[PDB]
């Protein structure tokens, strides 16, 4: 029973939570921009904390969403940073996962002091076909519990391909 | 200084509790309601006597605390702590008011007659109907005289008429004595803390059979 119960990446979300705006933020944006080929999008802080120097609507951070073979491309070159090794967690209860990296140069980008060094959060978000049902306008249904993604199925997929293990729990 | 209870005996005013509107009230003098052997199964204390009001009046938290102390002390003197479960089935929620018109001399320090006579809180009181139960005890059947005596001794510390009535029905609960017995025989009962849970014929058989295997199990 696996005709269309095949698990595939909905998308990959690349995030950098730079803590301020100006040079650091726009440079992080450039990093994402030439990493993805897609014009990234800048998010703003949703309230004020004052321990960190962030407040409302200050253009705090950057992210971008990628899909398809470019998504799994960026994913494998970024997973090779973690050496095909995750934890028992890093995997959501719903069937997604993610991992953080430092020194993004590990994904093939020169130092280039006109950019500088940034970390990243990668989040892989998964699905089985028939997710239009939950996103389309007309007749927006749910997905049945058979066809809902799950942590176990997602881990089994990520294991049986990618040559990846779950060291460190 | 705490003017008498004849001044607040009768349900003259509407109920007036601690709210966002009326705030800044004094605490109750009765704060404990369950005492004796509270961590006791229903099967241990088959008796009950109730102290029932026979008047539509309102009682004070002070009187409730006093009656509580008196009754507990008598019960504990004779029968012991592990012998009874005194529950106070009434709660002082109605707030009482004072205008507080001064007491030295109203010639120049006038206090303004009845201008602005709305009062501030004085204390707390329970509004008690006729037939409304007060002071359940639930002992064993052989502590009957003691419980009657203790409730009758508490009875002096309230206004109005109160009656001490015997009960069937395992008196924490409803469900008369033989019916409780036949259900406990059939296995329709579980001992949850201080009060039981009863079988229903409504929920899923999953839950009913994991929670009540003895009922239709054919081994006993």
């Amino acid at each position: 029973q696996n005709p269309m119960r095949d698990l595939k990446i909905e998308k990959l979300v690349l995030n950098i939570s730079v803590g301020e705006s100006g040079d650091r933020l726009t440079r992080a944006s450039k990093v994402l921009e030439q990493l993805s080929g897609q014009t990234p999008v800048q998010s703003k802080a949703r309230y004020t904390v004052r321990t960190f120097g962030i407040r409302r609507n200050e253009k705090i951070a950057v992210h971008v969403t990628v899909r398809g073979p470019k998504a799994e491309e960026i994913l494998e070159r970024g997973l090779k940073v973690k050496e095909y090794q995750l934890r028992d967690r890093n995997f959501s209860a719903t069937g997604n996962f993610g991992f953080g990296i430092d020194e993004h140069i590990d994904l093939g980008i020169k130092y280039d002091p006109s950019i500088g060094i940034f970390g990243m959060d990668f989040y892989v978000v998964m699905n089985r076909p028939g997710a239009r049902v939950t996103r389309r306008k007309r007749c927006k249904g749910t997905v049945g519990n058979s066809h809902k993604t799950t942590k176990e199925d997602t881990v089994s997929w990520f294991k049986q391909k990618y040559d990846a293990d779950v060291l460190d729990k | 200084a705490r003017r008498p209870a004849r001044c607040y005996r009768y349900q003259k005013n509407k109920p007036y509790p601690k709210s966002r509107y009326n705030r800044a009230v004094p605490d109750s003098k009765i704060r404990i309601y369950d005492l004796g052997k509270k961590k006791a199964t229903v099967d241990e204390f088959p008796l009950c006597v109730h102290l029932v009001s026979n008047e539509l009046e309102q009682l004070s938290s002070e009187a409730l605390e006093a009656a509580r102390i008196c009754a507990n002390k008598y019960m504990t003197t004779v029968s012991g702590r592990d012998a009874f479960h005194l529950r106070v089935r009434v709660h002082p929620f109605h707030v009482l008011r004072i205008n507080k018109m001064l007491s030295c001399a109203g010639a120049d320090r006038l206090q303004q007659g009845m201008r602005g006579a709305w009062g501030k809180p004085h204390g707390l009181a329970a509004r008690v109907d006729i037939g409304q139960i007060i002071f359940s005890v639930r002992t064993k059947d052989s502590n009957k005289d003691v419980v009657v005596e203790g409730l009758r001794r508490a009875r002096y510390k309230f206004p109005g008429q109160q009656k001490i009535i015997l009960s069937k029905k395992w008196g924490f609960t409803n469900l008369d004595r033989p019916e409780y017995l036949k259900k406990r025989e059939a296995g329709e009962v579980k001992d949850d803390g201080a009060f039981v849970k009863f079988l229903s014929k409504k929920g899923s058989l999953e839950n009913n059979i994991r929670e009540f295997p003895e009922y239709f199990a054919a081994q006993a």
Partner: protein
């Protein structure tokens, strides 16, 4: 110190029927209102335009006008020792027909048909209504229903 605004004392009135909030149903708008039709007034808090004042809640009037979105209702209002003719521009969400005169017109049709049938067959319909009359004589049989004797019960507490 007092407050006597338009929607004063209207809290529970213009509440909205538990589990009947929002999304007015469209038979309300498809219902047709001709001049002379009797209509009951029952405001809807969800439609803030064209509302009645709280006086006219549950009052039943007659239509004098018909407009785009509304109808004009006539009411007779007590002011002292008299009644006064009040005209209300109210939207149709606050308005419903009257099953009273509906039933009256049914009885009209039946009275006409009955009078016709009688003019054919047999005169003296007696087509008015009469109140509930006292019931006639009858015979109440035992034959299996013997009278069961009841006694007053003694006092018991069961508490």
């Amino acid at each position: 110190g007092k407050s006597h605004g338009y929607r004063s004392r209207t809290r529970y009135m213009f509440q909205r029927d538990f589990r009947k909030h929002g999304a007015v149903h469209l038979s309300t708008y498809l219902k047709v209102y001709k001049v002379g039709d009797i209509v009951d007034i029952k405001a809807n808090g969800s439609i803030q335009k064209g509302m009645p004042h709280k006086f006219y809640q549950g009052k039943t009037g007659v239509v004098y006008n018909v407009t785009k979105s509304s109808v004009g209702v006539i009411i007779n209002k007590m002011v002292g020792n008299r009644y006064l003719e009040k005209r209300l521009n109210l939207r149709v969400e606050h308005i419903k027909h009257s099953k009273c005169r509906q039933e009256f017109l049914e009885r009209v049709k039946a009275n006409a048909a009955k009078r016709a049938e009688a003019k054919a067959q047999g005169v003296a319909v007696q087509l008015k209504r009469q109140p509930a009359q006292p019931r006639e004589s009858r015979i109440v049989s035992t034959e299996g229903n013997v009278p069961q004797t009841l006694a007053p019960v003694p006092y018991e507490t069961f508490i």
